[PDB]
Each structure stands twice: as C-alpha cells, then as structure tokens.
Amino acid sequence: MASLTEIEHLVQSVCKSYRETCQLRLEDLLRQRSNIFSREEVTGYQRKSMWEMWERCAHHLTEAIQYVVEFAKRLSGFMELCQNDQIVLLKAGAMEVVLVRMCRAYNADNRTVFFEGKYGGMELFRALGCSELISSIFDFSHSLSALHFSEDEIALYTALVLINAHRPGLQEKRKVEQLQYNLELAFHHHLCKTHRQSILAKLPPKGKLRSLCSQHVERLQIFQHLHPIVVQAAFPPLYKELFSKILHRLLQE
Numbered sequence: 555m556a557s558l559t560e561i562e563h564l565v566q567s568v569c570k571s572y573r574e575t576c577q578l579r580l581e582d583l584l585r586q587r588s589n590i591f592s593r594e595e596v597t598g599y600q601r602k603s604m605w606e607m608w609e610r611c612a613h614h615l616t617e618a619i620q621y622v623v624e625f626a627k628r629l630s631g632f633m634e635l636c637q638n639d640q641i642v643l644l645k646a647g648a649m650e651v652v653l654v655r656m657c658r659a660y661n662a663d664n665r666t667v668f669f670e671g672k673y674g675g676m677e678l679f680r681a682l683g684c685s686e687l688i689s690s691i692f693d694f695s696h697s698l699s700a701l702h703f704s705e706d707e708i709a710l711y712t713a714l715v716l717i718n719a720h721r722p723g724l725q726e727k728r729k730v731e732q733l734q735y736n737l738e739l740a741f742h743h744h745l746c747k748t749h750r751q752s753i754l755a756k757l758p759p760k761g762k763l764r765s766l767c768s769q770h771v772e773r774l775q776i777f778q779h780l781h782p783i784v785v786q787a788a789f790p791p792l793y794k795e796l797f798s799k800i801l802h803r804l805l806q807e
C-alpha cells in the first residue's frame with residue numbers, strides 16, 4: 555500500500571497543513587532577533603507575581619495549542635480517525651507539538667526566546683518558580699536549534715509527534731499505526747531526497763518530550779495547590795481541560 559507518488563503527495567500535504575497553521579511565519583521571528591528585552595523590562599517580569607506570570611504563560615500556550623488543533627484537523631487522515639482517538643492524540647501530543655514548534659522562536663546565539671513581542675532569556679521566567687522546567691525547555695529548544703530544521707522537516711516531524719499509535723486509550727490502534735507508518739515514510743523519503751538522513755540519529759528520544767510534558771503537569775499541580783482559585787477563575791478553559799469539553803467543540807467546528 556502507498557506508492558512513491560502517493561508518499562510525495564503526503565509530504566506536500568503535511569507541509570502545506572503546517573504552513574497554514576503556524577502562529578507566526580519563521581521570517582517574522584528571524585526579523586525580530588535584535589528586538590531584545592532591556593534589563594529594566596527583564597526586572598519587570600521578575601517582579602510580577604507568580605500567579606500573574608503563570609496566567610500569562612498558560613494564555614500563550616493555549617493560543618499555541620489552538621494552532622496545533624487546527625494543524626491536526628488539516629492533517630491527512632486525522633479527521634478520518636474516531637473522535638475518541640482524535641481527543642486521545644491531541645491530549646497527549648498537543649503540548650509536545652507546541653514544544654517542538656517553539657524552537658522556531660528560539661535564538662541559539664544568545665539563548666533567548668521570542669515572548670510577548672521581544673526576545674528574552676531564561677531569567678525572564680524566574681517569577682514562575684519552576685526554574686528546572688524552564689531550563690529543560692530552553693535546553694530542548696537549543697538541542698533542536700543545533701539540527702537546523704527546515705520548515706518542511708518541522709512539519710513532517712511534528713505530524714509524527716502527534717500521530718503516535720502508542721498513546722494509551724486508542725480504540726482504533728491499527729488505523730493510527732497505518733497513518734503513522736505513512737507519515738514515517740513521507741518524513742524519511744523527504745530526508746533521503748534532501749540528503750538529510752543524518753538528522754535521524756540526532757532527533758530527541760521520545761522520552762525527552764514526555765518528561766517535559768510530565769514536568770509541566772507536575773509544576774501545574776504544585777501551582778494549583780497553592781492558588782486553586784486563580785486556576786479556576788483565570789486560567790484558560792482549554793488549558794485546564796488538557797493539563798489540570800472545549801476539545802470536542804474545536805474538533806466539530
């Protein structure tokens with residue numbers, strides 16, 4: 555099943571779905587690299603309360619996750635899976651896709667990330683009280699930056715992050731296995747055609763994205779135990795559904 559012509563069509567389809575669902579174009583991010591937060595603006599972020607900084611980060615992640623949902627809806631074969639499996643895949647993989655997409659907003663030259671209109675280092679997030687998780691995220695983005703991914707490679711790699719037939723709870727595991735296998739062929743065919751197969755051994759182990767997502771859920775539990783009413787009243791509903799139904803509504807639209 556699936557011939558060479560069909561594999562190449564899938565490559566172009568995934569790349570197109572990714573381009574249409576990017577929050578900001580790569581060119582926009584690269585053109586902002588000299589726009590760095592001043593020492594006074596960094597101090598301002600560090601002086602914010604922990605709950606206000608958490609709310610700002612949860613809002614930005616929720617917006618990023620909305621683009622990932624749209625990417626999934628446009629992904630060939632995803633809407634053909636049952637709704638149980640669409641929700642299982644998105645609950646487990648949406649944050650993983652956001653964390654990979656984040657390398658596009660990361661500048662390896664000065665270790666800064668584009669956040670709220672300017673580039674800032676890890677120290678910008680000190681008020682969160684989760685230095686280990688923030689350090690891990692920056693290290694992860696640095697590791698991806700070292701691969702020099704093209705937009706097409708991020709599109710194919712993120713499609714595989716999402717279409718993972720090993721997620722617990724899948725009712726139609728074989729159908730997800732088939733889609734995953736076609737996407738693996740599409741990704742490996744593209745790498746082979748562009749002489750980029752050397753990146754396969756340099757991609758992060760699957761346990762790496764899993765540990766970042768588990769650390770996020772653990773830090774959110776600590777924060778929610780200290781500020782339960784802040785989470786109830788001021789965190790985005792989609793964020794609480796995934797990490798603490800909206801997903802079903804987004805998938806129906």
Ligand SMILES: COc1ccc(Oc2c(Cl)cc(CO)cc2Cl)cc1C(C)C
Pocket residue numbers: 610611612614615649656659667668669679682684687688691692766770773
């Ligand atoms: C996975 O958890 C994350 C992920 C990111 C995060 O903070 C960031 C946000 Cl919202 C945006 C950018 C630039 O796009 C970079 C970082 Cl480090 C905080 C958390 C926790 C504290 C909610």
